[PDB]
Design a protein around this ligand. Structure first.
Ligand SMILES: NC(=O)C1=CN([C@@H]2O[C@H](COP(=O)(O)OP(=O)(O)OC[C@@H]3O[C@@H](n4cnc5c(N)ncnc54)[C@H](OP(=O)(O)O)[C@@H]3O)[C@@H](O)[C@H]2O)C=CC1
Length: 468
């Protein structure tokens, strides 16, 4: 089954370090002024009890890489740095990726590289991930740290220690495992600490939709980025599924290239299609769009494919840059979320990416926005609302023209999927109500060699094909 070999999901399996062998040297604890004091004290005593001197580094919000580079050069020799920037962090207004902890995490990493400390950075987050459906993601933006983090580990393994999540407001777990985590031979760099043990992030193959639950499109289905490559294939699938009415949105709208043939193609499949110009980053524009939907054909589902790729190295990335470039995906999602929350939707699908599922060099700026969607989908489900964040691999029938990039991808273990097949995996994911399904064609032989090129990983320990 070509549709069952593309299905994966993220699970958190119990695990441990493996003899911490205590510590040795001085450790720096990065934190904002008068913030995460309780957690800092916990980390200090924990690290010190392991035989290591602990000094703190008070960071000024959005200070920049330069300031931190000068300061890290006078600190002397450092064994490692523990970041608490994302701990006890407020969740005010502005854009979600405007988070100070994201901007400063990048600055600390860049600063450590320039100062040439030669030590790894370990970042702590609070309820940024969920080990199970019963746990709620506190702020979906904190997941962006995990998304960019996975890329940084691939681009500069020496400076990146790993990511550790703990229950918000709790310091017990950290004080008990931090020592082993930072000095373990397991190689775990993506962990979640809970009152009931330590868990590691793992990829696992998904089963099959052995349920009578079959998602069907009704009323009006809205597709953002509907006139784009992937959006257009989704629209075709919906039409073939029997969708009565389709609303395709993009900034270009009717002026989109190929829009005419798309509409004709969709209606030729038996679906009244409408194409409108609408910038999903404009709150009022979206509202007016939703208020324009007929009463006889109420909105039943949203497919958010709107986005823009960036491409760039971590050394050239900044919190500001990332927030700016991913507005359509992030603000579009947040806007659609808050404006349709009261509607009786049967499906709310966010288009994530392999960029956040495992990450890859070059996509450090793209990974953050995709990770935000993953968390936002989990939060909706925790609140009793429908949501699916699909982490897509590459697509074959889309606008991927290729020159240097596609060829490198395929010999790296990632093959583009036929559009029709990708959509059928989505259908199966909906039928089983999977919150964050991963749909990608990966050839593990070639993949593992390219992924573990210069850094070991346990992410795929439960993958049979990756096991062999
Ligand atoms: N193709 C690939 O290699 C990969 C794709 N994927 C997945 O596929 C998804 C779909 O995107 P894809 O088709 O590949 O990309 P495309 O860039 O081909 O873009 C669709 C386009 O979407 C629309 N859009 C952009 N900004 C806005 C906005 N503010 N409001 C409304 N619509 C907007 C626009 O339509 P218009 O011009 O009409 O304004 C835009 O031109 C991704 O988001 C990702 O989840 C993941 C990995 C790789």
């Amino acid at each position: 089954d070509e549709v069952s070999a593309l299905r994966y999901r993220i699970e958190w399996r119990p695990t441990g370090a493996g003899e911490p062998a205590r510590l040795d040297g001085t450790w720096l604890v990065a934190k904002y002024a008068g913030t995460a004091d309780e957690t800092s004290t916990a980390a200090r005593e924990a690290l010190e009890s392991a035989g290591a001197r602990v000094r703190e580094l008070v960071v000024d919000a959005r200070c920049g890489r330069d300031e931190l580079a000068e300061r890290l050069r006078s600190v002397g020799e450092v064994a490692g740095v523990l970041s608490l920037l994302a701990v006890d962090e407020a969740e005010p207004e502005e854009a979600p990726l405007a988070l100070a902890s994201l901007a400063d995490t990048l600055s600390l990493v860049q600063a450590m590289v320039s100062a040439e400390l030669g030590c790894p950075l370990w970042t702590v987050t609070e309820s940024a991930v969920a080990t199970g459906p019963f746990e709620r993601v506190r702020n979906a933006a904190h997941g962006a740290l995990w998304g960019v983090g996975r890329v940084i580990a691939l681009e500069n393994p020496a400076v990146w220690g790993g990511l550790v999540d703990v229950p918000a407001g709790s310091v017990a777990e950290l004080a008990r495992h931090l020592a082993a985590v930072v000095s373990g031979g397991a190689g775990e760099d993506q962990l979640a600490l809970r009152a009931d043990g330590v868990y590691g992030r793992r990829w696992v193959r998904a089963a099959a939709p052995a349920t009578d639950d079959e998602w069907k499109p009704t009323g009006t289905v809205l597709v953002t980025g509907g006139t784009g490559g992937v959006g257009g294939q989704i629209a075709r699938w919906l039409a073939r599924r029997g969708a009565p009415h389709l609303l395709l949105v993009s900034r270009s709208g009717p002026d989109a290239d190929g829009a005419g043939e798309l509409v004709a193609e969709l209606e030729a499949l038996g679906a009244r299609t409408t194409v409108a110009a609408c910038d999903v980053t404009d709150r009022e524009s979206v509202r007016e769009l939703l208020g324009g939907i007929g009463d006889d054909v109420p909105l039943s589902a949203v497919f958010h494919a709107a986005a823009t790729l960036d491409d760039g190295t971590v050394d050239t990335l900044t919190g500001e840059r990332i927030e700016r470039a991913s507005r359509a995906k992030v603000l579009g999602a947040r806007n659609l979320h808050e404006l349709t929350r009261e509607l009786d939707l049967t499906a709310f699908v966010l288009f994530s990416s392999f960029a956040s599922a495992f990450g890859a060099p070059g996509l450090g700026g793209y990974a953050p926005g995709n990770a935000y969607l993953d968390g936002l989908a989990q939060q909706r489900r925790s609140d009793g609302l429908p949501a699916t964040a699909v982490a897509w691999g590459t697509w074959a029938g889309s606008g991927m023209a290729e020159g240097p990039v596609a060829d490198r991808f395929r010999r790296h273990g990632v093959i583009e999927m036929p559009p029709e097949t990708a959509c059928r995996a989505l259908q199966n994911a909906l039928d089983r109500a999977e919150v964050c399904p991963i749909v990608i064609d990966v050839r593990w032989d070639r993949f593992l060699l390219a992924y573990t090129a210069q850094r070991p990983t346990r992410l795929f320990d439960e993958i049979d094909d990756a096991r062999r």
